Write a protein that binds this DNA or RNA. Structure first.
Length: 180
DNA sequence: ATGTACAAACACACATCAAAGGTTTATAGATACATTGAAACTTTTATATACGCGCCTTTTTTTTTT
Protein backbone atom coordinates (compact mmCIF):
# COMPACT_ATOMS: atom_id res chain seq x y z
CA UNK A 1 0.00 0.00 0.00
CA UNK A 2 2.30 2.71 1.29
CA UNK A 3 -0.69 5.07 1.25
CA UNK A 4 -2.40 6.43 4.35
CA UNK A 5 -6.18 6.75 3.90
CA UNK A 6 -6.48 10.51 4.33
CA UNK A 7 -9.55 11.39 6.36
CA UNK A 8 -11.59 14.38 5.23
CA UNK A 9 -14.51 14.26 7.68
CA UNK A 10 -15.02 12.87 11.16
CA UNK A 11 -18.57 12.87 12.55
CA UNK A 12 -18.80 12.26 16.28
CA UNK A 13 -21.44 12.32 19.01
CA UNK A 14 -21.00 14.13 22.33
CA UNK A 15 -23.44 13.94 25.25
CA UNK A 16 -23.07 17.28 27.01
CA UNK A 17 -25.63 16.02 29.54
CA UNK A 18 -27.89 19.09 29.63
CA UNK A 19 -31.04 20.22 27.84
CA UNK A 20 -29.43 23.16 26.08
CA UNK A 21 -31.45 26.27 25.30
CA UNK A 22 -30.66 26.23 21.60
CA UNK A 23 -31.96 29.81 21.37
CA UNK A 24 -29.59 30.99 24.10
CA UNK A 25 -26.86 28.79 22.62
CA UNK A 26 -27.30 30.64 19.32
CA UNK A 27 -27.51 33.98 21.14
CA UNK A 28 -24.33 33.70 23.24
CA UNK A 29 -22.22 32.24 20.44
CA UNK A 30 -19.97 34.25 18.13
CA UNK A 31 -20.86 32.75 14.72
CA UNK A 32 -23.45 29.99 15.07
CA UNK A 33 -26.11 29.01 12.54
CA UNK A 34 -29.26 27.88 14.34
CA UNK A 35 -32.87 28.34 13.31
CA UNK A 36 -35.53 25.66 13.95
CA UNK A 37 -36.80 25.75 10.36
CA UNK A 38 -33.96 23.46 9.23
CA UNK A 39 -33.06 21.35 12.27
CA UNK A 40 -33.44 21.07 16.04
CA UNK A 41 -29.69 21.51 16.49
CA UNK A 42 -27.46 24.57 16.76
CA UNK A 43 -24.75 24.23 14.14
CA UNK A 44 -21.45 25.85 15.05
CA UNK A 45 -18.30 26.10 12.94
CA UNK A 46 -15.15 26.55 15.01
CA UNK A 47 -12.07 27.38 12.99
CA UNK A 48 -9.71 25.71 15.50
CA UNK A 49 -10.21 22.88 15.15
CA UNK A 50 -12.37 23.81 12.18
CA UNK A 51 -15.38 21.55 12.66
CA UNK A 52 -19.10 21.90 11.96
CA UNK A 53 -21.39 20.54 14.65
CA UNK A 54 -25.13 20.18 15.20
CA UNK A 55 -26.18 20.01 18.85
CA UNK A 56 -29.75 19.00 19.59
CA UNK A 57 -32.38 19.68 22.23
CA UNK A 58 -31.10 16.46 23.81
CA UNK A 59 -27.75 18.21 24.13
CA UNK A 60 -26.21 15.63 21.80
CA UNK A 61 -23.73 17.05 19.32
CA UNK A 62 -22.64 15.48 16.04
CA UNK A 63 -19.42 16.92 14.62
CA UNK A 64 -18.19 16.78 11.04
CA UNK A 65 -15.25 17.98 8.97
CA UNK A 66 -12.64 16.95 11.52
CA UNK A 67 -9.33 15.64 10.20
CA UNK A 68 -8.67 13.33 13.15
CA UNK A 69 -10.14 11.64 16.17
CA UNK A 70 -8.36 14.35 18.15
CA UNK A 71 -9.52 17.22 15.92
CA UNK A 72 -13.12 16.19 16.64
CA UNK A 73 -12.45 15.39 20.30
CA UNK A 74 -10.71 18.69 21.05
CA UNK A 75 -13.32 20.54 18.99
CA UNK A 76 -16.08 18.91 21.04
CA UNK A 77 -14.33 19.80 24.29
CA UNK A 78 -14.12 23.39 23.07
CA UNK A 79 -17.80 23.13 22.13
CA UNK A 80 -18.67 22.03 25.68
CA UNK A 81 -16.57 24.89 27.08
CA UNK A 82 -18.43 27.32 24.80
CA UNK A 83 -21.76 25.89 25.99
CA UNK A 84 -20.66 26.29 29.61
CA UNK A 85 -19.72 29.91 28.92
CA UNK A 86 -23.22 30.22 27.45
CA UNK A 87 -24.46 28.94 30.80
CA UNK A 88 -25.10 25.20 30.49
CA UNK A 89 -22.85 22.75 32.30
CA UNK A 90 -21.87 20.82 29.18
CA UNK A 91 -19.64 17.83 29.84
CA UNK A 92 -17.64 15.47 27.61
CA UNK A 93 -19.42 12.23 28.52
CA UNK A 94 -19.72 8.97 26.56
CA UNK A 95 -18.29 10.52 23.41
CA UNK A 96 -18.21 8.36 20.30
CA UNK A 97 -17.19 9.05 16.71
CA UNK A 98 -20.11 7.91 14.57
CA UNK A 99 -18.35 8.22 11.21
CA UNK A 100 -14.87 8.61 9.73
CA UNK A 101 -14.92 9.42 6.01
CA UNK A 102 -11.72 9.97 4.09
CA UNK A 103 -10.30 10.51 0.63
CA UNK A 104 -6.84 9.37 -0.42
CA UNK A 105 -5.19 8.26 -3.65
CA UNK A 106 -3.47 5.19 -5.06
CA UNK A 107 -2.50 7.21 -8.19
CA UNK A 108 -2.37 4.36 -10.70
CA UNK A 109 -5.14 4.30 -13.33
CA UNK A 110 -7.62 1.51 -12.61
CA UNK A 111 -9.61 -0.91 -14.76
CA UNK A 112 -12.76 0.11 -12.90
CA UNK A 113 -14.68 -1.63 -15.67
CA UNK A 114 -12.94 -4.89 -14.83
CA UNK A 115 -13.77 -4.64 -11.15
CA UNK A 116 -17.39 -3.60 -11.60
CA UNK A 117 -18.05 -6.14 -14.35
CA UNK A 118 -16.37 -9.02 -12.51
CA UNK A 119 -17.64 -7.71 -9.17
CA UNK A 120 -21.13 -6.96 -10.35
CA UNK A 121 -22.22 -9.18 -7.48
CA UNK A 122 -20.46 -6.79 -5.08
CA UNK A 123 -20.13 -3.56 -7.09
CA UNK A 124 -22.73 -1.97 -9.38
CA UNK A 125 -22.24 0.60 -12.14
CA UNK A 126 -24.44 2.96 -14.15
CA UNK A 127 -21.76 5.22 -15.63
CA UNK A 128 -24.36 7.65 -16.98
CA UNK A 129 -24.88 9.56 -13.72
CA UNK A 130 -21.72 9.11 -11.60
CA UNK A 131 -18.42 7.52 -12.68
CA UNK A 132 -17.55 5.82 -9.36
CA UNK A 133 -17.67 2.23 -8.17
CA UNK A 134 -19.09 1.20 -4.79
CA UNK A 135 -17.35 -1.63 -2.94
CA UNK A 136 -18.10 -3.35 0.38
CA UNK A 137 -15.97 -5.10 2.98
CA UNK A 138 -17.30 -6.69 6.16
CA UNK A 139 -13.89 -7.29 7.80
CA UNK A 140 -13.46 -4.47 8.34
CA UNK A 141 -16.90 -3.24 7.24
CA UNK A 142 -15.82 -0.34 5.03
CA UNK A 143 -17.67 0.89 1.96
CA UNK A 144 -15.30 2.41 -0.58
CA UNK A 145 -16.01 4.77 -3.47
CA UNK A 146 -13.59 4.46 -6.38
CA UNK A 147 -12.95 6.81 -9.31
CA UNK A 148 -10.59 6.69 -12.27
CA UNK A 149 -8.58 9.63 -10.89
CA UNK A 150 -7.37 7.21 -8.21
CA UNK A 151 -9.39 8.86 -5.46
CA UNK A 152 -10.48 6.47 -2.73
CA UNK A 153 -13.37 7.58 -0.52
CA UNK A 154 -13.40 5.24 2.47
CA UNK A 155 -16.47 5.43 4.69
CA UNK A 156 -18.29 3.30 7.24
CA UNK A 157 -16.09 3.31 10.35
CA UNK A 158 -16.11 4.94 13.76
CA UNK A 159 -12.31 4.89 13.51
CA UNK A 160 -9.70 5.69 10.90
CA UNK A 161 -8.26 2.28 11.81
CA UNK A 162 -10.92 0.26 10.01
CA UNK A 163 -10.35 2.72 7.16
CA UNK A 164 -6.66 1.78 7.26
CA UNK A 165 -7.31 -1.97 7.38
CA UNK A 166 -9.80 -2.01 4.53
CA UNK A 167 -7.47 0.27 2.56
CA UNK A 168 -4.58 -2.14 3.09
CA UNK A 169 -6.97 -4.80 1.81
CA UNK A 170 -8.32 -2.80 -1.15
CA UNK A 171 -5.17 -1.13 -2.50
CA UNK A 172 -3.89 -4.58 -3.58
CA UNK A 173 -7.19 -5.01 -5.41
CA UNK A 174 -6.65 -1.57 -6.95
CA UNK A 175 -3.12 -2.37 -8.13
CA UNK A 176 -4.47 -5.68 -9.41
CA UNK A 177 -7.14 -3.71 -11.29
CA UNK A 178 -4.67 -0.99 -12.23
CA UNK A 179 -5.21 0.07 -15.83
CA UNK A 180 -2.06 1.09 -17.66
C1' DA B 1 -169.30 -17.99 -0.94
C1' DT B 2 -164.27 -16.17 -0.23
C1' DG B 3 -160.82 -14.07 -0.57
C1' DT B 4 -156.92 -12.02 2.98
C1' DA B 5 -152.72 -11.19 6.47
C1' DC B 6 -149.04 -14.87 7.54
C1' DA B 7 -145.51 -17.52 7.02
C1' DA B 8 -142.77 -22.19 4.80
C1' DA B 9 -140.37 -23.02 -0.42
C1' DC B 10 -137.03 -21.30 -4.32
C1' DA B 11 -134.45 -19.19 -6.90
C1' DC B 12 -132.20 -15.09 -6.52
C1' DA B 13 -130.31 -9.69 -5.24
C1' DC B 14 -127.13 -8.48 -1.34
C1' DA B 15 -123.43 -7.95 1.68
C1' DT B 16 -118.59 -10.53 2.15
C1' DC B 17 -114.39 -12.84 1.04
C1' DA B 18 -110.28 -12.84 -1.16
C1' DA B 19 -106.50 -12.27 -4.87
C1' DA B 20 -103.98 -8.53 -6.60
C1' DG B 21 -101.28 -4.32 -6.29
C1' DG B 22 -99.69 0.68 -5.66
C1' DT B 23 -97.13 3.08 -1.85
C1' DT B 24 -93.76 3.66 2.59
C1' DT B 25 -90.40 2.54 4.87
C1' DA B 26 -87.61 0.13 8.13
C1' DT B 27 -84.06 -2.14 6.99
C1' DA B 28 -80.54 -3.51 5.19
C1' DG B 29 -76.75 -3.30 1.24
C1' DA B 30 -73.55 -0.59 -0.14
C1' DT B 31 -71.20 4.32 0.26
C1' DA B 32 -68.78 7.75 1.01
C1' DC B 33 -66.36 10.16 4.03
C1' DA B 34 -63.98 10.73 9.22
C1' DT B 35 -59.98 8.72 12.70
C1' DT B 36 -56.08 7.61 13.78
C1' DG B 37 -52.14 5.24 14.65
C1' DA B 38 -48.71 3.27 12.28
C1' DA B 39 -44.69 2.83 9.58
C1' DA B 40 -43.08 4.31 5.15
C1' DC B 41 -41.28 8.51 4.51
C1' DT B 42 -38.67 13.19 4.50
C1' DT B 43 -32.91 16.05 6.59
C1' DT B 44 -26.94 17.35 7.46
C1' DT B 45 -22.87 16.96 5.67
C1' DA B 46 -18.82 16.98 3.58
C1' DT B 47 -16.42 14.88 1.04
C1' DA B 48 -14.02 14.73 -2.20
C1' DT B 49 -14.97 13.03 -6.70
C1' DA B 50 -16.96 15.43 -12.14
C1' DC B 51 -21.48 17.14 -13.96
C1' DG B 52 -25.31 21.74 -15.13
C1' DC B 53 -28.32 24.75 -14.42
C1' DG B 54 -30.45 28.29 -12.64
C1' DC B 55 -29.95 31.58 -10.08
C1' DC B 56 -26.30 35.12 -7.26
C1' DT B 57 -24.34 38.28 -9.24
C1' DT B 58 -22.60 41.22 -12.37
C1' DT B 59 -20.78 43.87 -17.47
C1' DT B 60 -22.46 45.41 -22.00
C1' DT B 61 -26.03 46.46 -24.58
C1' DT B 62 -30.68 48.66 -25.05
C1' DT B 63 -34.28 51.82 -24.92
C1' DT B 64 -38.49 57.30 -24.06
C1' DT B 65 -39.14 62.42 -22.91
C1' DT B 66 -37.65 67.50 -22.98
Amino acid sequence: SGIVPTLQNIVATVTLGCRLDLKTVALHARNAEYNPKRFAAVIMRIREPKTTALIFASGKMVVTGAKSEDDSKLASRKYARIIQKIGFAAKFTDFKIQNIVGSCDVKFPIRLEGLAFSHGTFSSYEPELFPGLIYRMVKPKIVLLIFVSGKIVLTGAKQREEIYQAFEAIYPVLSEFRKM
